């Protein structure tokens, strides 16, 4: 029941290394920190607009 | 047809009727049955007297009074003198049985009062004198009702029968966790509990072990008014079910 995942390596000069995970305990709280999710959505803070603001257009018209 | 208030129970050469019952409680969901070949340990053939043992034994009935605190009986010991059940229990090291317990109490539309009727498994009672130990004669009078006390004290090696702690260090209002019914004089004239053999071992000695205790405790006191029949008894009749006995020898006590 082992999980294989990808290690944080770095941009190589013009790669994929893996690591292994086995969860030892019966409680998900006991698991490692969720450090590899680089997901984001600034939209809700940077643009909470009802009417979509198109950059090349004037903001007011 | 068939009003669910009316009931007829027949066991051996015995029938009890009631025209004001409130269903019947099968202890822990289980109807009594015989010890099976998987669960057995005593290798000898059991004697199963069927109708001769498994029938309705009416024990000495007690009087309910306005201030009367409560009563208990101990099984199988209460039946140690009841006919051939008693004899079989006397001549055998081991015995096993379930029971149909039927408590009777009738009064009138004009009377009021409510009793808890409960079968407590392993109701191991405390000594009144916390320092000392209790003893059999203050634990059971066989077929005669042992009374609960309103008074917080008793004679040498008597049980602490103070009703609100049910003789065993707990809240009497929680006794309801055990197989129980209530005879509320407004509603019904009888209670019926069908108790299975509840114990940690397949058979046991009929004298040494009081497998369960029947407690009848008045939560709402008996009352009536100006000249309306004073005497109102409570009668307990019980029938052994699926009774079988192992290990036969001489007449037994010691």
């Amino acid at each position: 029941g082992a999980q294989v995942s990808t290690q944080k390596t770095g941009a190589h000069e013009t790669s994929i290394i893996h690591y292994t995970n086995i969860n030892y305990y019966k409680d998900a709280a006991s698991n490692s920190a969720n450090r590899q999710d680089f997901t984001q959505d600034p939209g809700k803070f940077t643009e909470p607009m009802k009417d979509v603001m198109i950059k090349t257009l004037p903001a007011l018209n | 047809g068939y009003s669910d208030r009316v009931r007829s129970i027949t066991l051996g050469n015995s029938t009890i009727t009631t025209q004001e019952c409130a269903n019947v409680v099968v202890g822990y969901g289980e109807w009594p049955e015989y010890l099976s070949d998987n669960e057995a340990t005593a290798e000898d053939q059991p004697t199963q007297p069927d109708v001769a043992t498994c029938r309705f034994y009416t024990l000495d009935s007690v009087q309910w009074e306005n201030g009367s605190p409560g009563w208990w009986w101990k099984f199988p010991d209460a039946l140690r003198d009841m006919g051939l059940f008693g004899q079989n229990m006397y001549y055998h090291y081991l015995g096993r049985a379930g029971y149909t317990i039927h408590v009777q109490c009738n009064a009138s539309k004009f009377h009021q009062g409510c009793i808890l009727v409960v079968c407590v498994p392993e109701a191991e009672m405390g000594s009144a004198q916390t320092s000392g130990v209790v003893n059999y004669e203050h634990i059971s009078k066989g077929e005669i009702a042992s009374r609960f006390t309103t008074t917080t004290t008793a004679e040498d090696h008597g049980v602490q029968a103070a009703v609100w702690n049910a003789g065993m260090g707990v809240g009497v209002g929680n006794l309801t966790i055990f197989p129980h019914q209530w005879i509320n004089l407004r509603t019904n004239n009888s209670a019926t509990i069908v108790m299975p053999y509840v114990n940690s071992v397949p058979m046991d000695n009929m004298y040494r072990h009081h497998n369960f205790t029947l407690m009848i405790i008045p939560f709402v006191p008996l009352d009536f008014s100006a000249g309306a029949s004073t005497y109102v008894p409570i009668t307990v009749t019980v029938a052994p079910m699926c009774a079988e006995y192992n290990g036969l020898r001489l007449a037994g006590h010691q």
Binding site: K26 | A22, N23, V25, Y28, K74, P121, E122, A123, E124, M125, G126, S127, T130, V133, V134, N135, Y136, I139, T152, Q160, A162, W164, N165, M168, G169, V170, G171, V172, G173, N174, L175, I177, F178, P179, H180, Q181, W182, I183, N184, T187, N188, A191, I193, V198, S200, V201, P202, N205, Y207, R208, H209, H210, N211, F212, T213, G252, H253, Q254
Partner: protein
């Protein structure tokens, strides 16, 4: 299900609230008869008009196992570093649940109990005050020996009994992790009995109560080290965890305070706490 096969569960969530509408009818879900011995299986939607709620709550920690399977202290015992002459150089404990108040009330909520047990034991030491308390005392090893009902009791800190040619023993050095064992369902009967309304003798006499059934044997404790010039005292705390549990016949929890570890005695207490008035805020 198999209480010994731990990694094999059953996910059972709590019941959802179904939406109720208004009603005007002959069916009466909240009118019943307590006398019956039955508990009302009413849901709020039988009395009010409810919305639809999805209860993903689970009755997790109230499982008999999660409730009992937390390691509790049942007793602690004390013994000094000494010679054959010193009675206090070793000690023993007759194994029993009824010695402490907390685990006893938990177990006693059930009449009959069948489980395996994890025993952990925290043995702690301290220097006795003495002119010699200055002393280079080396690491102390300890011996815990189980003597099952029938075997030889150790009469001294130093006798043949401690050989343990057949009794189970644990040798433990200080500084290390606490000693731990697992125990099977050790009883002669099909379940442990927290209560016995009965007698040790067929003639309705001898010992009354649970004591009669719960003959578990005993734990003997000693230091394996020879004594240093100044005495050192050790105290062993025995911890119990009921694991792989099964329980039968629920009881009311103990209202009255416990008095004896030997018997079920109590002195009568009030049913509940008193309040100012029957109409309270």
């Amino acid at each position: 299900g198999d209480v010994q096969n731990a990694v094999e569960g059953a996910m059972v969530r709590v019941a959802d609230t179904v939406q109720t509408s208004a009603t005007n009818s002959e069916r009466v879900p909240n009118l019943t008869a307590v006398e019956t011995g039955h508990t009302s299986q009413a849901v709020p939607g039988d009395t009010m008009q409810t919305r639809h709620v999805i209860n993903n709550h689970v009755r997790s920690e109230s499982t008999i196992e999660n409730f009992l399977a937390r390691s509790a202290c049942v007793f602690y015992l004390e013994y000094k570093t000494g010679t054959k002459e010193d009675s206090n150089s070793f000690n023993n404990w007759v194994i029993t649940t009824r010695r402490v108040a907390q685990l006893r009330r938990k177990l006693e909520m059930f009449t009959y109990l069948r489980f395996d047990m994890e025993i952990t034991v925290v043995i702690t030491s301290s220097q006795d005050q003495s002119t010699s308390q200055n002393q280079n005392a080396p690491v102390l090893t300890h011996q815990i020996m189980y003597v099952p009902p029938g075997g030889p009791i150790p009469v001294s800190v130093d006798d043949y009994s401690w050989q343990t040619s057949t009794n189970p023993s644990i040798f433990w050095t200080e500084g290390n992790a606490p000693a731990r064992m697992s125990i099977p369902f050790i009883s002669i009967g099909n379940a442990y009995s927290n209560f016995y309304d009965g007698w040790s003798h067929f003639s309705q006499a001898g010992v009354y109560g649970f004591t009669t059934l719960n003959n578990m044997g005993q734990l003997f404790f000693r230091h394996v080290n020879k004594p240093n010039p100044a005495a050192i005292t050790s105290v062993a705390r025995i911890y119990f965890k009921p694991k792989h549990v099964r329980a039968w016949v629920p009881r009311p929890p103990r209202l009255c305070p416990y008095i004896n570890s030997t018997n079920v005695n109590f002195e009568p207490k009030p049913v509940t706490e008193v309040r100012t008035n029957i109409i309270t805020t």
